[PDB]
């Protein structure tokens with residue numbers, strides 16, 4: 633019985649930590665973040681949930697939530713504040729990628745070792761990316777889309793840990809900042825985001841076997857700054873801003889039928905959440 637955890641968000645920055653159970657449709661309210669945050673990222677390592685970066689105002693904080701105790705614990709902060717951050721996990725380490733600090737649009741990347749509570753800088757990305765989506769497939773880390781400070785991006789790049797090097801991959805078919813990015817079945821999905829003119833409902837995926845991006849069925853709601861995760865073989869998108877409204881909608885993508893459906897609503901509409909499953 634794994635749960636979808638949503639941490640933080642915006643409607644000011646929010647402290648909520650809530651867990652959705654897709655099997656019975658219930659939402660459970662859990663211990664608040666010590667410091668409210670939007671534009672943060674969530675991830676899980678060793679069954680512990682981590683909330684990373686965001687804006688409280690730009691945040692360098694890392695905090696760890698233990699589902700077994702229902703408690704948060706502070707961790708070592710990052711080298712720099714990272715609002716609009718993306719995060720990925722490889723080999724039990726958290727990678728914090730991109731984000732912004734005031735006028736700084738980061739290309740820097742750093743890695744956290746939970747066992748010794750230590751961050752270390754690694755190679756910076758080829759492109760500065762705030763509002764970047766991050767996913768990990770076969771122990772490679774992908775940074776997708778974002779905004780470089782001048783141009784909104786359809787480009788994507790891949791980090792090779794054994795070599796501490798970034799390489800551009802095929803660009804998406806759509807410019808997206810603030811997209812939800814995840815991995816399902818050897819494919820990197822990019823859902824929603826902002827193309828510089830509108831929030832998006834389109835969804836595309838990158839097949840590592842073909843090196844090509846292909847559109848799948850669109851979401852019912854346009855959304856940027858959405859939470860996203862995979863649970864029991866399906867993609868879930870949580871909240872976001874549609875250009876007008878802070879959404880409470882949670883949609884769920886079934887890949888076998890290429891269909892989206894509305895499965896629940898968050899307890900209050902919000903954007904800029906961090907999401908993980910454990």
Ligand SMILES: COc1ccc(S(=O)(=O)N(CC(N)=O)c2ccc(N(CC(N)=O)S(=O)(=O)c3ccc(NC(=O)CCN4CCC5(CCOC5)CC4)cc3)c3ccccc23)cc1
Nearest residue numbers: 642670671687762763779809810826856857873875903904
């Ligand atoms: C004022 O309203 C909001 C919206 C979001 C949040 S927030 O909490 O989520 N947040 C705060 C933080 N700094 O922490 C983040 C902010 C930005 C983020 N993007 C920037 C990035 N990726 O670089 S974005 O998503 O691409 C984005 C980009 C542009 C907008 N412009 C508008 O909508 C203006 C409205 N106009 C109305 C008319 C239309 C035209 C057609 O119909 C709609 C177009 C749009 C919005 C989002 C966040 C990304 C990830 C995570 C968080 C992001 C708070 C308040």
